[PDB]
Design a protein around this ligand. Structure first.
Ligand SMILES: *[C@@H]1O[C@H](CO)[C@@H](O)[C@H](O)[C@H]1NC(C)=O
Lengths: 232, 13
């Protein structure tokens, strides 16, 4: 998370780290006691379910309830050469037990809407600037959803924004996702104090630069996919 | 329950 602040214990209990050979590659987020959601590009190069692990809490290096990946499922239409269809699910070989630190997030119904000046949160153990290293401590940032129209300016991102993608950040930059944050959550809280998964950190030019916000996979667009694959 | 956090958003300074 660019210019990201340290997240408190138990603030984002659905947040997970995905490690390949005990190195952090990517975020995920919990949706059941067995299943997580993340990006497809996380498994671009590292394709062995059995060398992936998952851990929770605010801290990688002293790992919480580390777990082994039974399997992962990537979107049929994802292709490493393009940015569309960037979603995957991950099932863990042992169910995990919900504490104050570890809990499942809610998924939105397929047709929920999110007014495009809405305040949303974004978290991950990724880099603090472009080309920086991952942190062992989870970080957060408050950004805002951004109109597809704004976003689809040729000055911004143009025709690279395809269905199932949306933007979030600030046109003034500073706060953003960075490398190591992909597959991790973009969330909001309804007025009944319940948190919901709206986005999955996907891509972007640099980190925290004017007119270069993050691009997220749009959960509501892939909501039926997730259901078919998880039963959630 | 899903989507519940037990720590406030409103933090001590
Ligand atoms: C929302 O905030 C942005 C700040 O960049 C402002 O420019 C915009 O006019 C506001 N609302 C919309 C989406 O028109």
């Amino acid at each position: 998370i660019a210019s990201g602040v340290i997240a408190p214990k138990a603030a984002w209990p659905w947040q997970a780290s995905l490690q390949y050979d005990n190195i952090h590659q990517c975020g995920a987020t919990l949706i059941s006691n067995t299943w997580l959601v993340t990006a497809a590009h996380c498994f671009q190069k590292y394709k062995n379910p059995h060398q992936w692990t998952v851990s929770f809490g605010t801290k990688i290096n002293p790992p919480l309830m580390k777990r082994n990946v039974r399997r992962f499922i990537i979107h049929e239409k994802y292709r490493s050469a393009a940015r569309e269809y960037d979603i995957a699910v991950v099932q863990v070989s042992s169910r995990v037990t919900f504490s104050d630190d570890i809990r499942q997030i809610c998924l939105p119904e397929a047709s929920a809407s999110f007014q495009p000046n809405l305040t949303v949160h974004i978290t991950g153990f990724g880099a603090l600037y472009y080309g920086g290293e991952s942190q062992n401590d989870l970080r957060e940032a408050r950004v805002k959803i951004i109109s597809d129209d704004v976003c689809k300016q040729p000055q911004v991102y143009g025709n690279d924004i395809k269905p199932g993608m949306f933007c979030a950040g600030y046109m003034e930059g500073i706060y953003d996702a960075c490398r190591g944050d992909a597959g991790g959550p973009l969330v909001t809280r309804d007025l009944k104090d319940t948190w919901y998964l709206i986005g999955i950190v996907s891509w972007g030019d640099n980190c925290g630069q004017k007119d270069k916000p993050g691009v997220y996979t749009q959960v509501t667009y892939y909501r039926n996919w997730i259901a078919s694959k998880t039963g959630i | 329950s899903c989507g519940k956090r037990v720590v406030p958003l409103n933090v001590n300074r």
